């Protein structure tokens, strides 16, 4: 394909004609909606599992654009749009008229005045053409700061996951920069990446030869083996290469 992901604000995640940004400052719902509005956008609208499957991989709980009407007793989006079925599971956590998004397309009912982190989302068409385009990526891949990512839920061993990424002219995840790949902070669970142990030298190196830079990953022993799973807060859990796990591909440099 080699498509430029369409008009988005600078350093936003662009996926399938939709821009996204995750705000780690915890604000209440009203403050959070204002914050998205002040950036010419609004809170997360969830309209399709297919076009927004990036949201399957998100860690933790975040304010969403969904609101409850006392009179109706129905749930609607900030702009008045109806909540379609076959999208969200609304769960009764707290008494309140707002909802937190969480992965597996869940929505927890929360008190609107409780501080939480939040997700802004704006469509590519509603951002003007004089703005940031994310660098060349394949059609249906997540573009963030010109690097391209896709998350594969069909679980395979390390070697098969390499071949899988190879078949799409890509390689397994390579962490090279906490700044440029800070998106990886919000990934949930663990996933195969391209980091391999050389047993003789006792060293760690990437698929393409590159040696692991210092102060980039924390490596923990879990299962004895010569391969590493990525997990959140830049961790690298040592796992047996033959153990089937999920994986992350990325377009190479």
């Amino acid at each position: 394909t080699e498509s430029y992901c369409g008009p988005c604000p600078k350093n936003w995640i662009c996926y399938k004609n939709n821009c996204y940004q995750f705000f780690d400052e915890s604000k209440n719902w009203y403050e959070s909606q204002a914050s998205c509005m002040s950036q010419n956008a609004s809170l997360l609208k969830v309209y399709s599992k297919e076009d927004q499957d990036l949201l399957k991989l998100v860690k933790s709980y975040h304010w969403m654009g969904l609101v409850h009407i006392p009179t109706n007793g129905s749930w609607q989006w900030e702009d008045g749009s109806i909540l379609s079925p076959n999208l969200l599971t609304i769960i009764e956590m707290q008494k309140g008229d707002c909802a937190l998004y969480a992965s597996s397309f869940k929505g927890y009912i929360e008190n609107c005045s409780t501080p939480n982190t939040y997700i802004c989302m704006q469509r590519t068409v509603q951002i003007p053409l004089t703005e940031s385009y994310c660098g060349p990526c394949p059609k249906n891949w997540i573009c963030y700061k010109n690097n391209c990512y896709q998350f594969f839920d069909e679980s395979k061993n390390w070697y098969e996951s390499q071949a899988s990424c190879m078949s799409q002219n890509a390689s397994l995840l390579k962490v090279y920069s906490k700044e440029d790949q800070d998106l990886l902070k919000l990934v949930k669970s663990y996933h195969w990446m391209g980091l391999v142990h050389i047993p003789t030298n006792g060293s760690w190196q990437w698929e393409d030869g590159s040696i692991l830079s210092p102060n980039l990953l924390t490596i923990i022993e879990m299962q004895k083996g010569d391969c590493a799973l990525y997990a959140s807060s830049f961790k690298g859990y040592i796992e047996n290469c033959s153990t089937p796990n999920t994986y992350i591909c990325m377009q190479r440099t």
């Binding site: 597996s104 669970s189 879990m222």
Partner: protein, 165 residues
């Protein structure tokens, strides 16, 4: 007749090396209900329960990896999650951790308070796990209120869909 729902996720490690598989034992109103592993759930189609329990099992594997024990050989971390619905519409719920079969850490999910054990040997296990859950896993109260809500949501789903008949 309080209706109850109880999950029992178990992970194992040999000589520090945490095994890839894990077994889940679910009890519904006291009676056995589901016996899962990573691959599938069997009733003693369950695709939602497989997806949910596997994600939990992965997280518990990482937890055990942060419990660096001197004792060699077999070690087991088990996390229990239980909730109830009484006749008067009030709820009970809790999260419990067993290491080698011995209870070392509990949380009342109604109040989000932790119960620490008596011996300082057991307190060492507890503060290891709590350090992991707070710093590495990065779990706020929200996580635990969601955990509470998830257990009650499933119990009400299993009652409403007619799985006690």
């Amino acid at each position: 007749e309080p209706h109850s729902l109880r999950y029992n996720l178990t992970v194992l490690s040999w000589d520090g090396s945490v095994q890839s598989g894990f077994l889940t034992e679910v009890h519904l109103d006291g009676q056995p209900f589901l016996r899962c592993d990573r691959q599938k759930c069997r009733a003693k189609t369950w695709d939602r329960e497989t997806r949910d329990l596997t994600a939990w099992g992965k997280d518990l594997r990482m937890t055990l990896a942060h419990i660096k024990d001197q004792k060699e050989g077999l070690h087991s971390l088990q996390e229990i999650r239980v909730c109830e619905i009484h006749e008067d519409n009030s709820t009970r719920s809790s999260q419990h951790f067993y290491y080698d079969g011995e209870l070392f850490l509990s949380q009342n999910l109604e109040t989000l308070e932790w119960t620490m054990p008596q011996s300082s040997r057991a307190q060492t296990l507890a503060m290891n796990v709590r350090n992991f859950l707070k710093e590495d896993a990065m779990q706020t109260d929200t996580h635990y209120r969601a955990m509470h809500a998830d257990c009650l949501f499933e119990l009400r789903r299993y009652l409403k869909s007619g799985v006690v008949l």
